[PDB]
């Protein structure tokens, strides 16, 4: 037997396995669906970014009722290190009120102040060079960035010149410099912290910082290329798991843990393990003939992501070099790759297609003249209208609680609802951080090789379109500001300056929005059981003993920011919770 078995070797699972195996008396088995990465350039080198190397195959959404019934390919990692292995390395904490709100939903021990020690413990920040900090407007507060923890993060050591135009344009339209976006607020523009190891200017993914770093430990066991297919019980006690080869060989193996089973299989994986195991909504489990171990209607409910919109541009006077120089100028690309190979300088330190700066804004910063109209519309509408009729009443109660918390965030000048980015080339990105829409992820069969049904339900809550239209208009203001006008941008079809009304703009958005930036969360939510929760404040699955959820399935709702930094810090926190319960060193 092992002390602990962890299902999924992504950010959360490897962070937890690392910390638990600090005690040589504790043995851990991590079972991971994907393989070990091969250290290929597309993983290690930011400018060679090739995320598609390790996407989970064969996942498609249902037709999206709020997006003209489009079906989309679903993106999530299948690799040791999970999303950290293949993500764009953007390393950002949420805002204070995200964590405070999670506590106020009925979760003792959750707040910004309780998470800050774990953010610090998780990481080592390496400052940029002084010349780059001064030239680039890079600032930080060293008092709230960790100096001793495993996750290395820093910045690229270069910026494209057009990023200066965009910074100044953003400041011209009311997005000022942010001292430190890791300090719990991020209203304006800042350099993107990047999960890069500055010694080699390579990706610091969880495979490296929470497995390779400690891989001499005989008590830290990994089994790549295998799927956890079921949790095994003795009564209501979780005692082990069944696993199969990911590749579909007709073989099943049982393995047992003396203390606990931890699920770390991600927003789209954890609810499937639970449902196949009889932990889930009795209606679904009964329809598939699965015996009910714990009747939890929240499992696979409450799916959230952070939608994205790519706006195309043409320019009369764009500045050289820019990110698109790497794809259209073989001489520039070769010279930048030679520069990286020699002295680790230049464009290849930036994740391909990204720039170095970004902006985040509250609803009142996006829409100073109309945010109170959006809040009124959202306040007037019953929470229940965002969910199908016959949604479990407990799940509706938890959604109403989340919705009330998010409407307080809409009123708050210090909480973000949207992100704007320009990579310096032919497109800008606008991200909707705080959707009120909620989706589902449900098994369709008892076959553990069958994809679940994934329905994002993007844009089903009509408030989302009002927020997202306001974010689009703020992006347009940046591109129309003096410092950007000198590059001669214009929106290209299917957008364009000739789309002036909300109706005109949103009809194109409805056709172009991507439901997902692979930020899937919240499908095994940490809320009281009577609010449709799946886990307690200690991340224990209701109705069973010895079973926790570590991956971002547990989150109640999306952050003002992208998930990775909090995925690491939440696993650091949970490792201490588990150590305390079991008296571990
Ligand atoms: C392409 C892309 C790009 C981005 C991002 C993701 C992706 C895929 N994200 C999101 C972020 O990386 C993601 O939210 C976290 O990795 C989630 O961490 P978890 O531990 O919850 O799951 P994670 O996805 O890391 O790990 C879950 C693991 O479980 C495994 N698994 C699933 N089912 C299993 C089963 N039954 N048995 C065994 N193993 C199983 C999977 O193979 C996977 O490795 C991101 N975030 C951010 O902050 N910055 C960014 O730049 C980006 N960009
Ligand atoms: C990545 O973070 C680790 C952890 O802080 C850094 O590791 C330190 O490395 C130095 C010199 O390499 C050693 O003297 C220390 O013993 C290490 N500390 C720990 C806590 O392991 C590493 O330096 C970081 N990378 C960069 C670029 O700073
Ligand atoms: C989407 O499909 C449903 C039927 O599945 C239909 O009622 C609806 O009109 C369609 N929506 C659009 C935008 O075409
Ligand atoms: C940095 O900010 C100053 C204004 O304080 C501005 O003049 C300059 O262009 C900015 N540079 C970049 C690279 O953002
Ligand atoms: C291509 O890049 C090279 C190397 O930096 C530069 O000298 C040249 O002017 C570029 N050509 C064009 C057409 O941009
Ligand atoms: C509106 O602008 C777009 C983008 O340039 C273009 O596709 C379209 O033809 C324009 N409409 C008219 C009527 O000119
Ligand atoms: Mg230095």
Residue numbers in the entry: 46 to 630
Copy out sentences from the published article reporting this entry, exactly as the authors wrote them.
Cystamine, which was used for CtFDO complex preparation by co-crystallization, was found to improve the diffraction quality of the CtFDOdegl crystal, but without any electron density being found for the compound. The structure is presented as the ligand-free structure of CtFDOdegl and is referred to as the CtFDO:free structure. The CtFDO:free crystal structure has two CtFDOdegl molecules (chains A and B) in the asymmetric unit, with an r.m.s.d. on Cα atoms of 0.12 Å. The cofactor is noncovalently bound to the apo­enzyme via hydrogen bonds to 13 surrounding residues (Ile56, Ser57, Glu77, Ala78, Val124, Gly128, Asn132, Ala133, Val135, Val273, Ile597, Ser607 and Met609) and indirectly via 12 water molecules. A composite OMIT map of the isoalloxazine ring confirms the nonplanar conformation of the ring with a 20.0° (21.4° in chain B) bend around the N5–N10 axis (measured for atoms C4—N5—C6), which indicates the reduced state of the cofactor. Absorption spectra of an unliganded CtFDOdegl crystal measured before and after X-ray exposure showed that FAD was oxidized before and reduced after exposure and that the reduction occurred during X-ray exposure. One exception is His564, which is always modelled in one conformation enforced by the stabilizing hydrogen bond with Gln351. The active-site pocket of CtFDO:free is occupied by water molecules, two of which are in the CS. The first one, the active-site water molecule (WAS), was found bridging four atoms: His564 Nɛ2 (3.0 Å; 3.1 Å in chain B), Ser607 Oγ (‘in’ conformer, 3.1 Å; 2.9 Å in chain B), Asn562 Nδ2 (3.3 Å) and FAD O4 (3.5 Å). The second water molecule, which is more distant from the isoalloxazine ring (WDAS), is bound between WAS (2.4 Å; 2.6 Å in chain B), Asn562 Nδ2 (3.5 Å; 3.4 Å in chain B), FAD O4 (3.6 Å; 3.8 Å in chain B) and Tyr OH (3.5 Å in chain B, 4.7 Å in chain A).
The FAD-dependent oxidoreductase from Chaetomium thermophilum (CtFDO) is a novel thermostable glycoprotein from the glucose–methanol–choline (GMC) oxidoreductase superfamily. However, CtFDO shows no activity toward the typical substrates of the family and high-throughput screening with around 1000 compounds did not yield any strongly reacting substrate. The structure of CtFDO reveals an unusually wide-open solvent-accessible active-site pocket with a unique His–Ser amino-acid pair putatively involved in enzyme catalysis. A series of six crystal structures of CtFDO complexes revealed five different subsites for the binding of aryl moieties inside the active-site pocket and conformational flexibility of the interacting amino acids when adapting to a particular ligand.
